[PDB]
Amino acid sequence: LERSYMELIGAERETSRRNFRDLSLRPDGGPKYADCAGGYCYSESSSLLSATRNRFLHWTSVEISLDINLVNNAVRLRILNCSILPGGVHICETPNNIVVLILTNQTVHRLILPHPSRMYDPSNTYVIPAIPGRAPNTTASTAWLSSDGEALFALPSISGGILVIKMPPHDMEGLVTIAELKQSSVMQRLLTGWMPSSIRGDQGPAHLPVSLAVHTLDHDSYLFALCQDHKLRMWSYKDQMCLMVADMLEYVPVSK
Amino acid sequence: ATYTVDCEDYVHVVEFNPGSLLAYGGISYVVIASCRFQEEDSTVEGIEFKTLKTFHHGERVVAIAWSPETRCDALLPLLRFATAAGDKKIRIFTFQDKNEYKVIEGHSGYINDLVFCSPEGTDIASVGDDHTCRIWDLGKQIAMFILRSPGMSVAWHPEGAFKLMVAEKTGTIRFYDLTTHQAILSLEMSADWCVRNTLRIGAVAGNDWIIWEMQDNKPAHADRRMFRWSKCNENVFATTGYPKSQIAIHHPQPILIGTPVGSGLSWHRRLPLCVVGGYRKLFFWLTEM
Amino acid sequence: LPEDDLAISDEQEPQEAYLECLFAPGRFTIAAVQKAIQILRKGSGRVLDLSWEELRKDVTLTVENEIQQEEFRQINIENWCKFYTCCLQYQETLSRPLALLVHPDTNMVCLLRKGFLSFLAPCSLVEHLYLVPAEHLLTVDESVISDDIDAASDIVNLIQCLRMIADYISEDMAYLMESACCHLQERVAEQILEDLIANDIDNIMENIQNKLQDTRNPIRAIGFLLQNMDYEMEQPQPNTRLNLSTASSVVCQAICKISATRFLICRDLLILQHLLLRLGDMALIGAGQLLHSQQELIPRAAQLLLSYYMIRWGSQCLACAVPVDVEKRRYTSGIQTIVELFFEDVARKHFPHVFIQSGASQNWSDLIKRITNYLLQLLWPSNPNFQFAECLMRNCQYTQLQEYVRLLLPWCQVNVGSCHFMLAQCYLVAGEGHKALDCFSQAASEVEREDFLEKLIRVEEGESVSPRLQYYNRVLRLLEDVGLPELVIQLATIAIGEARSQAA
Description:
part of a larger assembly; 3 chains; A: mainly beta; 5-stranded mixed sheet; 4-stranded antiparallel sheet; 3% helix; globular; B: mainly beta; 30 strands; WD40_repeat_CS (chain B); Nucleoporin Nup37 (chain B); nuclear pore complex (chain B)
């Protein structure tokens, strides 16, 4: 036997007792009303006690945030020199506000959302020296805080690599610094394979991050990652080193 | 052009069809006026009202209909009315006697409308906010029928006394045959009949209006107040703005008349005039075409 | 399954029916309808600055303008069908899922689609019975008794008998039954069968009679199922009436799905009882009762008429609500439909302590179970429509109150002077001053101490001063306040004739 779930559907259209709130960052069919990649965000009140009860935002990528919470309205943003890449939106919480990290096709935008009044300095525009030479892929923000913010970016082509951006919002109106992370996997447990093949400028290496996820237990700051050669990797944010690896069973997880 | 008379008390206006006389519902009761064709200037088709007399009841008349039983002798008018009173009573007046229908048997809500018809006997139909339609047969027999929602209007099939129409506030129009099975047909301010009942109208307060030539049951045509039927012409249709005084004649959109507030209005027995009651005045308007 | 047809006239003409069937499907967004309007016209972003009702009018007017009695009806139906298909086609691009996120503040999994948001719910008993098949209903392993009659196999046989008789009715036939069932509130079962059932049933009537006769005690069985379907120990009570505390929009859509499935099942029960009552069979007539003390299908039928009434009321409440041109229940002013407004009046959350249920084990799901309750658990409390309609009236929702006026008069046991006093106020607000008087004259408010209705306060302020002539004194003042000066005076005279209070 098996039980059936049922779903409840709500249309992402304007609330018939509210309206919108529009923003442009900087000088500007199926596209118009059908998203390419959205996500939800939850700024939980165990970490973010100042948001009591925490706001549940919906983000759809022209970039629409709807409060799907037990609270209020929506906001929208227009993004110069389109579009927001799939997975290019990331969210984490400051002790008094919610921050959106957005990549377009090769610009980094840092948007603080004034959620107490938008549903009832907001944007800083950054160009990152890694981006002119390498394509962006996935992002994970380690932290977004009131006066700071730190984020992890993976690149797929012409070669794989992992970038840390560190931002000071309130120092000199948003200067930025880089840290290059070598993915320094000295050993791996279990199986073992290594084959780094290169020919054309269009290539992906073995150590390309396929997927990654951030983690916070008390003072333990860690990032988990999966490589193209199927390595499960444990990256310490603090030391910027790979503390542990395991090599998986081989199979083909490319578009074959 | 028009003929105008001031009036002390005013409510509903009916014209005598079941013959050149007019009844003004009022707070005290009903004033009877006479339509006189004469004009002393020898210009004809100028029509005056003579206020013959005020009938007294002591209660407000909301709705009134004449009976065919009315006659005129050598000066004395023998007149019979089916009336609606403020205390939710339907009465039959002869000032010799007054029939009362009230009590448990009567309506316990506002009575929106009443109509009279002639079989081998006489029938009074009435509809109320109590959610009932009642038939009164003239030995006294009564019937009480449930409506789905409050009955705003009721009218008997012209040339066919057994069938009637009820308009419920919800918008259901029902076709009732008292003699046969009660709910013969249904359709989804007032509804009324037209012609020899060859047509059915249905009028809403948002001003949408349906025309049925009683294929499927779908309305043949529809346009855009409360409908008041031209007695002779099926296609000529009258509407008004109660709260101004814009009166529209529809069959394009003509606005023929603009008077103050308009209480109630009706067509002359042969169609040439419209009688209009305003707050302070009663009026004959001639319309041609 | 969605079905569509012509209309004789009960659920109006096709234009109105297609307009509701286009605005109401849960596979609908505004942007897809607006894009479809562009195909039958031109335009683009200018349709965004239109009100929802103006958008309904532009769609309806656009379809009517193109079409130039039977061919006119057929061509008009086809244009609406083409428009419905085009709206759905643009919309199904949105049905693509993009991601799935769990939220720990809520007990919610959230599905992200390309322009629709979804959440997962467990199915109710009503949803499980509505969907096919009969075998899958019987495959549910018996936990409250053994593999046996009280499980119940005999009950599950009866609910599928109900559903088969209901599957016979067309949409035209179903609409005439709706017109009848609210009006129905005489010896109704005999007449209701003759017009509605007898014409539209084959001689499957013999097959229905035989199967009902074979089953032992079928009245007890389907009465116990009704109790399980209107089932929303101490633990059960705790899991029942959950604790009194976007959320509205979400459960409005759930209450519509649950109301529609129940609305069929409550009708289906009535249809089978109507079918049983006009059978010339002694054995089946005897199976429709406990003999002495006598309890027939007549007591059961009354509860079904009441459940149908409350559910059909809630189904109507989906469509409408008019705006003007945080503690104080701020949703009330800002809601977009009456079912959402009805939802929010019933607000719940499991986590807060309940003053009147201190032993309860500690909002979306909780609130559904409680809205479903208030329709189903009746005792001493006031009529549900009357309480909700008063809340609407208090928030100045006169058109919505006017729409539901007919429902304030229903079955005689549920009809009270407070309901009639509300009819009278609604008629005053909507300018129907004559009908307002008729209701005020027939019904008396001699309910001086009823804390529940904010509407009674104006009567009660004088009842604290004075005694029963105060009803006419109140209505006298109310009609002064709306400027109806013939009717005011009569009540002042009634108030003296019914009679420090004299001086006042």
